[PDB]
Amino acid sequence: ENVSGISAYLLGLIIGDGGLYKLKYKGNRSEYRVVITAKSENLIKQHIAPLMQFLIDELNVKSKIQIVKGDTRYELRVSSKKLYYYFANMLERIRLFNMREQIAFIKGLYVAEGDMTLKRLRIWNKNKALLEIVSRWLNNLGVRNTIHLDDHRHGVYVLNISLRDRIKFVHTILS
DNA sequence: GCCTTGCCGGGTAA
DNA sequence: GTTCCGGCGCG
DNA sequence: CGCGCCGGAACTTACCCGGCAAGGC
Ligand SMILES: [Cl-]
Ligand SMILES: [Mn+2]
């Protein structure tokens, strides 16, 4: 479906450059947040937000897309119990993504946490198990890759995509 | 040569 | 990237 | 009383970038 794909992509952005938060305030107040942060307000307004808005319309979510200016980056924020569980449940069923979703999701994760220089093809994350999942999808799409611990200061692993397959990767995934 | 990729420090964009 | 804050709405 | 959407803001740190050098054809 068109929404499952846009969903997979947004989840990549979210995991890569934002998050999902179940907040608890005093006294017994709460909030659920779907967040993507970025340096460029323009990317957020022009590229990311129209995608999220579509998803919101599609799910009859009522919350508004908030764009908040932070000291170091802009934050897209949807304050919504519904949107939150939607993405959170999807994250839990990640291993079952089909090809369409796999691709969309890797695209989102790469845009967010990849080497966009493209001189090398790399993805960074502290979650090894998440990288191992991506690694297998790639291998099965004919894109060889390795994982090792890149940054010993912060426990950040890198998924390195063999440049022998640079073309199949840039073409297949970053479409 | 040249290409690839593991290594590792800077500092800003998460 | 994450979690405080004070606000508000609502059964 | 209990919870869930707003609008920030302060707070922390995980990324991305990019030079180097070892191994391979
Ligand atoms: Cl995971
Ligand atoms: Mn990023």
Please give the structure tokens belonging to residue A75: 């934050």
Please tell me whether residues A23 and A9 are part of one structural domain: yes
Q: List the alpha helices (DSSP H) in chain A.
A: 2-17, 41-43, 49-58, 81-92, 99-113, 128-140, 166-172
Please tell me whether residues A93 and A107 are part of one structural domain: no
Residues A41 and A29: beta-carbon distance below 8 Å: no
The spacing between the Cα labelled CA in A174 and the C1' in D11, in angstroms, equals 34
* Partners of residue A19 on adjacent β-strands: A35
Q: A143 lies in which domain range?
A: 101-175
Please tell me whether residues A114 and A65 are part of one structural domain: no
What's the CATH code of the domain at A54?
A: 3.10.28.10
Protein residues within 5 Å, CB atom, of ion ligand 1 = A 129-130
The spacing between the Cα labelled CA in A161 and the C1' in D22, in angstroms, equals 19
Instruction: Return the closest-CA partner of residue A132 out of A154, A118, A117, A149.
Output: A149
Burial-class residue A29 by CB neighbours within 10 Å (0-12, 13-18, 19+): exposed
Q: Hey, CA dihedral for A151, A152, A157, A160, is it positive or negative?
A: positive
The spacing between the Cα labelled CA in A156 and the C1' in B2, in angstroms, equals 30
Please tell me whether residues A15 and A33 are part of one structural domain: yes
User: Cα separation of A103 and A8, whole Å?
Assistant: 8
* Partners of residue A160 on adjacent β-strands: A122, A146
Query: How big is the CA angle at A59 (ends A58 and A61), to the nearest 5 degrees?
Result: 115
- Residue with CA nearest to D13's C1' atom: A154
Q: Which of A79, A97, A115 is the last residue of a domain?
A: A97
Q: Hey, CA dihedral for A41, A44, A50, A52, is it positive or negative?
A: negative
Q: Which of A97, A122, A157 is the last residue of a domain?
A: A97
Polymer length of chain A = 175
Please tell me whether residues A12 and A68 are part of one structural domain: yes
Scanning the structure block, which residue is given the tokens 């200016």?
A: A69
Q: In sequence order, what DSSP letters do the residues of A108-151 get, joined into one string? A: HHHHHHB-TT-SS-EEEES-HHHHHHHHHHHHHTT--EEEEEEE
Longest dimension (CA), chain A: 57
- The answer to whether some atom of strand D lies closer than 7 Å to the beta carbon of A96 is no
Looking across all nucleic acid strands, the nucleotide with the smallest C1' to CA distance from residue A71 is: D9
- Going by their DSSP bridges, the two strands A30-38 and A18-24 should be labelled as antiparallel
Please tell me whether residues A9 and A89 are part of one structural domain: yes
Question: How many structural domains are present in chain A?
Answer: 2
User: Cα separation of A70 and A133, whole Å?
Assistant: 32
Secondary structure (3-state) at A174:
coil
Please tell me whether residues A38 and A83 are part of one structural domain: yes
User: Cα separation of A145 and A139, whole Å?
Assistant: 7
Please tell me whether residues A39 and A107 are part of one structural domain: no
Please tell me whether residues A79 and A111 are part of one structural domain: no
Please tell me whether residues A69 and A19 are part of one structural domain: yes
Strand order in the sheet with A122-125: A122-125, A156-161, A145-151
**Technique used to solve these coordinates:** X-ray
| Active-site annotation of A, residues | 17, 113
**Amino acid, res. A147:** I
Query: How big is the CA angle at A38 (ends A32 and A41), to the nearest 5 degrees?
Result: 105
User: Cα separation of A26 and A28, whole Å?
Assistant: 5
Please tell me whether residues A170 and A140 are part of one structural domain: yes
